[PDB]
Specification:
- This protein is an all-beta fold.
- The chain has one domain: Roll (SH3 type barrels).
- It is about 0% helix and about 25% strand.
- Strands 2-3-4 form a three-stranded antiparallel β-sheet, with no helix packed on it.
- A hairpin with a 5-residue loop joins β2 and β3.
- About 15% of the residues are buried.
- The PDB classes it as signaling protein.
- The entry lists the keywords GTPase-activating protein, GAP, Ras p21 protein activator, p120GAP, RasGAP, Structural Genomics, nppsfa, National Project on Protein Structural and Functional Analyses, RIKEN Structural Genomics/Proteomics Initiative, rsgi, signaling protein.
- The assembly is monomeric.
Length: about 70
C-alpha cells in the first residue's frame, strides 16, 4: 500500500455502450461509480453501484461529484 488517493466519486452524465468481448461495462445516465484505479489513455477501474460490477470507463463520459451543495 503506497501513497495514493482515497476514492474519487463520479457519475455517468450519459449512457455508454460497453465494448463487445471485453471487461467494459454498460451503464446508464445517472448511475454512480467508485474510482479504484486510475488507468492511462483516459481510463479508470471503477465499479457501477447499480450493476455492482467492475469495469473500465472513460473520464470523458463521467463527471466529478464534488461541491458545497448537498446531494
Amino acid at each position: 500500500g503506497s501513497s495514493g488517493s482515497s476514492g474519487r466519486r463520479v457519475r455517468a452524465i450519459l449512457p455508454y455502450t460497453k465494448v463487445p468481448d471485453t471487461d467494459e461495462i454498460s451503464f446508464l445516465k445517472g448511475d454512480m461509480f467508485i474510482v479504484h484505479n486510475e488507468l492511462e489513455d483516459g481510463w479508470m477501474w471503477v465499479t457501477n453501484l447499480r450493476t455492482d460490477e467492475q469495469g473500465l470507463i472513460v473520464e470523458d463520459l463521467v463527471e466529478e461529484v464534488s461541491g458545497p451543495s448537498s446531494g
